[PDB]
Structures are given as structure tokens and as C-alpha cells.
Ligand binder design. Structure first.
Ligand SMILES: Nc1cccc2c1CN(CCCOC1CCOCC1)CC2
Length: 150
């Protein structure tokens, strides 16, 4: 019973989380996952500020209200070469990665590793935070509050 959470640097508190190396998070699970990081889904304004501080990914993820990809540099295989906060308009499907916003993070780029999942609850799952530099932090717990996600 294992979940891996790959996390990015934070930019103005905003970061990206990918579950188990594939698009696999529902909107309800996304909210719960951010809550486990003492975080919330970012607003569009929070995401725009993060983008301005250097945040970009090549992955769709939830924010409050939309599914987006922040892009700084045009790349043909990331958000169809767009820059800015690219908003997904048309999709059949419901599972993506997520973004999260931590108000207590530093104001600009924080590329230190994440070494805690401070608001996980008691549970049976081995949850492993995986940083981009490979450093890991694991704990037994749960974060999902909706049965249809479990
Ligand atoms: N942040 C982090 C921490 C630990 C592991 C990983 C990450 C970030 N993942 C980046 C995934 C990028 O995939 C792109 C999307 C499709 O085009 C190829 C690149 C790759 C795996």
C-alpha cells in the first residue's frame, strides 16, 4: 500500500505534485492532497505570481477552478508552444496532477527539498515524498477523505 508524490521547487509558495508518476489525481483528491501539505489549490493570481518568479512545468494540474500548465519558455511539446498560465479548455478526462500553494513558503524561488507531510492523517499507506534531486521522505498515513478516490 504505497503512494509516491513527486514534488517541485516552490515559487511564491506554489508547487507541482504528481502522484505515482502518472496523471492520476481527481479534483477531490487534489484538494485533499494539498491539505496534507498544509496547502490549498492555488488561485489563478497566485499561479501567475509563481510563474513570474520562475515557475514552469510540462504537466497539466489543478488549480482552483481550472486545469493549467505554467509556461515560461515556448516548447512545442508543452502546452502547444504557449507561454503564460496555459488553461486546458477541452478534455474528455478528469484526472491530472495538482498544484498546491503554501502561504508559509518563501516569497520567491525555493528549491530546497520537501522533507515533511505535516498534515497527513493516521492511515495504512506508505506515502513517499520524492524530490527532483531524489531525496525522499516517507511516512505511514492517509490524506484522502473521499471514498471514490480510495
Ligand atoms: N518534480 C519531480 C520530482 C521527482 C520526480 C519527478 C518530478 C517531476 N517530473 C517531471 C515530468 C515532466 O514530464 C514532461 C511532460 C511531457 O513531456 C516530457 C516532459 C519527473 C519526475
Amino acid at each position: 500500500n504505497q503512494i509516491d508524490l513527486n514534488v517541485t521547487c516552490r515559487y511564491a509558495g506554489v508547487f507541482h505534485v504528481e502522484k505515482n508518476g502518472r496523471y492520476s489525481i481527481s479534483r477531490t483528491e487534489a484538494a485533499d492532497l494539498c491539505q496534507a501539505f498544509n496547502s490549498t489549490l492555488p488561485t489563478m493570481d497566485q499561479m501567475k505570481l509563481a510563474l513570474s518568479k520562475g515557475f514552469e512545468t510540462c504537466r497539466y494540474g489543478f488549480i482552483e477552478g481550472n486545469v493549467v500548465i505554467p509556461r515560461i519558455h515556448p516548447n512545442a511539446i508543452c502546452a502547444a508552444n504557449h507561454t503564460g498560465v496555459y488553461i486546458l479548455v477541452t478534455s474528455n478526462t478528469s484526472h491530472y496532477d495538482t498544484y498546491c500553494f503554501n502561504a508559509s513558503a518563501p516569497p520567491e524561488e525555493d528549491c530546497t527539498s520537501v522533507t515533511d507531510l505535516p498534515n497527513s492523517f493516521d492511515g495504512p499507506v506508505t506515502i513517499t515524498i520524492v524530490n527532483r534531486d531524489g531525496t525522499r521522505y516517507s511516512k505511514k498515513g492517509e490524506y484522502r477523505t473521499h471514498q471514490e478516490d480510495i
